[PDB]
Amino acid sequence: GMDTSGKQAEAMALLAEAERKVKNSIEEACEIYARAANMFKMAKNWSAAGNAFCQAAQLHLQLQSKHDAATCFVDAGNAFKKADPQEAINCLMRAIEIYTDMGRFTIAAKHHISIAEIYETELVDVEKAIAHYEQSADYYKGEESNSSANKCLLKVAGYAAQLEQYQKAIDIYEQVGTSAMDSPLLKYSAKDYFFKAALCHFCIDMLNAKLAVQKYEELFPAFSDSRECKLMKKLLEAHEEQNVDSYTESVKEYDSISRLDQWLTTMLLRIKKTIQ
Template sequence: MADHEAKANQCMIDAEKKLKSSQGFFGSMFGGVQKQEDACELYQRAANMFKMAKKWQEAGNAFCRAASISMTLESKHEAATNYVDAGNCYKKVDHEKAISCLQEAIEIYTDKGKFTMAAKHYISIAEIYENELIELDKAIENYEKAADLYRGEDSTSSANKCLLKVAMYSAQQMNYAKACQIYEDVASSAVENSLLKYSAKDHYFKAALCHLCIDLQNAQIALQKYPETFSAFADSREYKLLQKLVAAIEDQNEDAYTEAVKEFDSITRLDQWLTTILLRIKKSISSDPDLR
C-alpha cells in the first residue's frame, strides 16, 4: 500500500512539472500541448495508484486534475470519463464532491448528445441522495431527470424503472396523487408489452393503495377501472386483498383489515414500503373522515 502511495505521489510531482513547463510563451512554443497530454496521463496514473492504496480523496483529486487538463485540450469525452472516475472515488469519502463531479460529466455528455450516458449518471447521483445523504426530494429530482432523458431516447423500460423510484418515494412523502399517476402510467405501458405484462399487477396494486391513502371513493373507482384495463388483475391475490381492505374501511372494522393483511402476508411477504402504506391506511380508518 505504501509503495503504491509513494509511486502516486511521485507521479503527481512529475505531472506538476510537466504542466508547469507547458505554460508561458516558451512552453506553448515547444511542445506545450504534448506536455499537457503527458501531465494528464501522469495524473491518471497517480489516481490509479492512489486507488490501489485506497487513498480515495487523493485519487479523486488526481482524476479531477486530469479532467481539467482534458477540458483545456478540448478532449471532452476524456474529461467526462475522468470526472466519472473522480466521482466514483469521492463516493467513498465525500458525497458532495462525488455529486459535483458527476454533474460535470453530465453536462459534457448532454452537450455532446450522449443522453443515455447522462441519464446513467443522474441515476448515480439519485442513489447517493437516496442511500447516503437521505435527501429524498433530491433523489426524486434526479430520477426524474434520468427518466426524461431515457424517454427522449425511446428507452421506455429504463425510464419506467426511474419513474417507479419516483412513485415509491413520492408515496413515502405522502404525495399520493403523483405516485398514483406514475404507477398507473407504468402499468398501462406494461400491459402493452408481452414481456412486462405480469408486472402490471404489482403497479396497479400500489396505485390502488395510494388511492386508498387519498380517500375511499378514489380506491373504489380504481377497483372498477383496473380490471377493465388489465383483466388478469381481477383474479390476483392483490385485487382480492384490496376488496377486503375497502370492505373493512367501509365497515370501520380494524380487526377485519388486520386479518386481511395478515392473510396476504402469509402468502406474499410484505416489503417495507407496503407495510408503511398499509399501516397508514389502517390508522386512517378511524381518524380520516373521508374514509368513513
C-alpha cells in the same frame, strides 16, 4: 510495509516532476499526473488521487480536449464517491454536462442514476434523488428505453407515495399499468401495479378507492378474477363497518396466504389507523 512508503514517495516525486515541467512554461505532464494518480490508487490513498485526476483533466482540457477530460472527470468522481460524495457529485455533474453538450444521452442518464443512488444511499435527500431519477427517465424515454424509463418511474412513484402526495403515485402506476398490460410478457404482473394505485386511493377516502377499483375492473376483466380485488373489497366492507377486527383478520389471512413487501403493510397500517 514497502508498498505504502515506496508508492507514496514515487507519487510525490511524479507530482513534483509534473509541477516543475509545467513551471517551465505539456502532454507529458498529463501523462505523469495520470501515472501519479495510478500509483496513489495502488497505495490505497483514495483522497488526493481525485485531485490529481482533476489536475490532469484541466491540463488536457486546456488544449481543447473534451473526451478524455470527461472520462478523467468521471473516474475522479467515482474515486471520490467513497472518499467524499460531494466532490464525486460535482465531478459527475461536470461529466454529465460535457456529455450532454456532446449529446451522449445514455452515459448522461447512467451518471444521473448513479448520482441519485449516491444521494439516496450515503446522504439523506430524496427530492434531489427524485429529480435525478426524473431526468434519467426522461433521457431514457427520449432514447425509447422502455424498461429503464418504467423502472425509474416506478421507483419515483414508490418514493412519492412513501413521502409525497398520492397523485403522483396514482398517475405513474396507472401509466405503467397501461404500458405493461398491453404487452404480452409483462401482463402477468400488470395487475400488481394497478392494485397499488387503488390502495393509494384508499388513503384519501373510501369512495375514491371504490371508484378506482371499479374503473380498473371495467378496464381489465382479469382484475375482477384476481384475489387482490376480493381482498380490497373485503377491506372496504370492514372499513364501512368500522370494524378493525375484520381488517386485522383479512390482513393476517392475506399474510398467511402470501408474504408481504413491508410497504403494503405500512399502507394498510395507515389505512386502519384512520378507520376510527
